[PDB]
Design a protein around this motif. Structure first.
Motif, mmCIF file in Angstrom:
data_model
loop_
_atom_site.group_PDB
_atom_site.id
_atom_site.type_symbol
_atom_site.label_atom_id
_atom_site.label_comp_id
_atom_site.label_asym_id
_atom_site.label_seq_id
_atom_site.Cartn_x
_atom_site.Cartn_y
_atom_site.Cartn_z
ATOM 1 N N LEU A 220 0.831 -1.196 0.000
ATOM 2 C CA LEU A 220 0.000 0.000 0.000
ATOM 3 C C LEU A 220 0.870 1.253 0.000
ATOM 4 O O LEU A 220 1.934 1.295 0.627
ATOM 5 N N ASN A 221 0.417 2.278 -0.719
ATOM 6 C CA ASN A 221 1.149 3.532 -0.823
ATOM 7 C C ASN A 221 0.179 4.703 -0.795
ATOM 8 O O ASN A 221 -0.999 4.578 -1.138
ATOM 9 N N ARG A 222 0.714 5.860 -0.415
ATOM 10 C CA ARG A 222 -0.081 7.068 -0.242
ATOM 11 C C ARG A 222 -0.530 7.701 -1.551
ATOM 12 O O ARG A 222 -1.236 8.717 -1.495
ATOM 13 N N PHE A 223 -0.162 7.153 -2.708
ATOM 14 C CA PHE A 223 -0.478 7.821 -3.960
ATOM 15 C C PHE A 223 -1.832 7.359 -4.498
ATOM 16 O O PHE A 223 -2.375 6.325 -4.100
ATOM 17 N N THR A 224 -2.363 8.148 -5.431
ATOM 18 C CA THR A 224 -3.581 7.815 -6.150
ATOM 19 C C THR A 224 -3.325 8.095 -7.622
ATOM 20 O O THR A 224 -2.607 9.041 -7.965
ATOM 21 N N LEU A 262 -9.017 3.639 -7.093
ATOM 22 C CA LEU A 262 -7.876 4.303 -7.714
ATOM 23 C C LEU A 262 -6.705 4.444 -6.752
ATOM 24 O O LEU A 262 -5.591 4.740 -7.194
ATOM 25 N N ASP A 263 -6.929 4.239 -5.453
ATOM 26 C CA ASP A 263 -5.828 4.180 -4.497
ATOM 27 C C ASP A 263 -5.092 2.847 -4.584
ATOM 28 O O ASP A 263 -3.858 2.809 -4.519
ATOM 29 N N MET A 264 -5.832 1.747 -4.754
ATOM 30 C CA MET A 264 -5.191 0.449 -4.931
ATOM 31 C C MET A 264 -4.546 0.344 -6.310
ATOM 32 O O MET A 264 -3.524 -0.334 -6.466
ATOM 33 N N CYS A 265 -5.131 0.995 -7.322
ATOM 34 C CA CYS A 265 -4.529 0.990 -8.651
ATOM 35 C C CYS A 265 -3.126 1.578 -8.632
ATOM 36 O O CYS A 265 -2.241 1.118 -9.363
ATOM 37 N N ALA A 266 -2.903 2.606 -7.813
ATOM 38 C CA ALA A 266 -1.564 3.171 -7.717
ATOM 39 C C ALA A 266 -0.597 2.183 -7.078
ATOM 40 O O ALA A 266 0.593 2.178 -7.410
ATOM 41 N N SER A 267 -1.084 1.344 -6.162
ATOM 42 C CA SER A 267 -0.230 0.307 -5.597
ATOM 43 C C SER A 267 0.065 -0.774 -6.629
ATOM 44 O O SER A 267 1.177 -1.313 -6.669
ATOM 45 N N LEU A 268 -0.912 -1.102 -7.476
ATOM 46 C CA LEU A 268 -0.660 -2.077 -8.534
ATOM 47 C C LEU A 268 0.313 -1.519 -9.567
ATOM 48 O O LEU A 268 1.089 -2.280 -10.157
#
Ligand code: A1IPK
Ligand code: A1IPK
Ligand code: CL
Ligand code: CL
Ligand code: NA
Ligand code: NA
Lengths: 305, 305
Positions: A220-224, A262-268
């Protein structure tokens, strides 16, 4: 807690599997009401498969040429019909174990449970996914033809697959229960090619939610990101494109975790661009794409039958 | 061809799963003949689970405190018993769907199929393995208690597991059908640790045979090792030691491949010391150990039931 390659309970389907024999070929059939469904190449010899004319081959067959046996009960074929690539044999007895059922045609990305049988008797059950190229990666030995894949909706069995062939590459091809093949494939023993397989991205995102629900959260990361920004990085990795419908379908999982889609998409995106750096998610060092979002809801919300 | 995480068909077991209710607690039970088997903490409240006295609680219980329901039919409890950690409830009816069965106590490394049920209704099925530390890594939400694990032998169901609890680390613990826990565990809500888990080496070697049968052969080498030489390299990687009894069991797979057992040990030794280097075996980037050699033979022979 926990996440496992899980399949629907196969009892309901087990009571519908009969042994169908025509000539020297013996395969599996699906006994629903007074009709048995089996792959139509039951009528072919090893030499006929190379270039078969099924209208000529079926003309040479008679009702007494088909030997259908449900365990100790020998059913009698009172009619034979050919719908597309499936042969429907009318029988003099109706399956008392016929469940509430429906024939559906699944889409690529959808998953289903396969009851693999040999000579009419179930051998095992495992979970598969209709690959984007309309193949499946199951386990089918000779005689598993007429094994069917299905999903259950409380009490209604949705038959969605019947196995027909192992392609030369080892991947598997089959039909819906109305006989229309999934994909560009034909029931003829000639070299046939499957399209380049792609990664079902919505199912990877589903699996990553299952991972967060279970305690793996290093990725997990803070980006979107935006759906378009993600889709340019995804298309490069032969990853399927994510639409707004995929984002909507992932809504329920986003809701129970509080992690926007879209928060999980940034982790992917970081995973694809940087790999997993020797770490594992739910125990795997690769990204699983054979769990639909509905599968994750089921395994972390109950869903009994 | 193909190799999948496959589970025994669960229809037979489905006919034995009942809902058991004592007080406010409702869990799953196993109905065999005129006896229902359920986890003995059915009689506990959340306040009792923290430190339960099962002999004191059962004294306050009577046959009318247990509500067993097979679908719409209420079975009548005419007797109750506590064997180890299992509560055996006598009922006024015998299960007409009782399969020919036997209660077995499996060894670490053996595999079985888990029928996960909730509130008496079967929900899914997956294949598990008794970890060397006497845990199992399944998928169980609250209410999954009394789910049973099993293997099928033609028509005889060998019940080998009943789920009782999830440990704090997320791994699962349960009993045999005689109520004896697998492992150092007690049915009390207190921190309990499982022994250090190891890799079932005989199952990795079995799996590598499944890979060669399927076309994966990059890992094969012209070298051969000794059992001692291999076990010195394996123990360093926390791999279980391979005995001559394991080699005998792998015999059938060696015969079908023409690859000696110590020839495959030499391929496994390089894999442990050098990793997979971006290669996959049967699609995996890690070494699977939850396939017994009999599982591989079953999936590459067509054993039915
Ligand atoms: C239940 C299995 C079969 O009956 C099936 C018959 C069949 C139909 C169409 C094409 C080929 C065979 N056989 C089958 O799929 C075998 C199964 C393996 C486990 C042996 N597969 C092959 O024979 C693979 O070779 C092959 C060559 C050319 C075409 C083709 O499929 C398009 C398969
Ligand atoms: C079917 C699930 C249960 O009924 C079970 C009861 C139980 C028995 C023994 C010890 C603890 C609980 N509960 C259970 O295992 C839960 C299930 C989760 C899905 C919530 N697990 C926990 O409560 C985990 O915490 C825990 C703390 C301390 C001890 C312990 O087991 C020794 C588990
Ligand atoms: Cl049609
Ligand atoms: Cl009594
Ligand atoms: Na993020
Ligand atoms: Na070798």
């Amino acid at each position: 807690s926990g996440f496992r390659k899980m399949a629907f309970p196969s009892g309901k389907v087990e009571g519908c599997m009969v042994q169908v024999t025509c000539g020297t070929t013996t395969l599996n059939g699906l006994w629903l009401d007074d009709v048995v469904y089996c792959p139509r190449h039951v009528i072919c010899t090893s030499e006929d498969m190379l270039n078969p004319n099924y209208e000529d081959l079926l003309i040479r067959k008679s009702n007494h040429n088909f030997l259908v046996q449900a365990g100790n009960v020998q059913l009698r074929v009172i009619g034979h019909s050919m719908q597309n690539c499936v042969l429907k044999l009318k029988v003099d007895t109706a399956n008392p174990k016929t469940p509430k059922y429906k024939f559906v045609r699944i889409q690529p990305g959808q998953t289903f449970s396969v009851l693999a049988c040999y000579n009419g008797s179930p051998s095992g059950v495992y979970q598969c996914a209709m690959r984007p190229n309309f193949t499946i990666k199951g386990s089918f030995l000779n005689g598993s033809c007429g094994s069917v894949g299905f999903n259950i909706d409380y009490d209604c069995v949705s038959f969605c697959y019947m196995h027909h062939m192992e392609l030369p590459t080892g991947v598997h091809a089959g039909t819906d229960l109305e006989g229309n093949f999934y994909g560009p494939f034909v029931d003829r023993q000639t070299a046939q090619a499957a399209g380049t397989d792609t990664t079902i991205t919505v199912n990877v995102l589903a699996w990553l939610y299952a991972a967060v629900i279970n305690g793996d959260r290093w990725f997990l990361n803070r980006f979107t990101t935006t759906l378009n920004d993600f889709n340019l990085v995804a298309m490069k990795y032969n990853y399927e494109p994510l639409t707004q419908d995929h984002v909507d379908i992932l809504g329920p999982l986003s809701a129970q975790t509080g992690i926007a889609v879209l928060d999980m998409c940034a982790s992917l995106k970081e995973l694809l661009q940087n790999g997993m750096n020797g770490r594992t998610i739910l125990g795997s060092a690769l990204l699983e794409d054979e769990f639909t979002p509905f599968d994750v809801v089921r395994q972390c919300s109950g869903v009994t039958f």
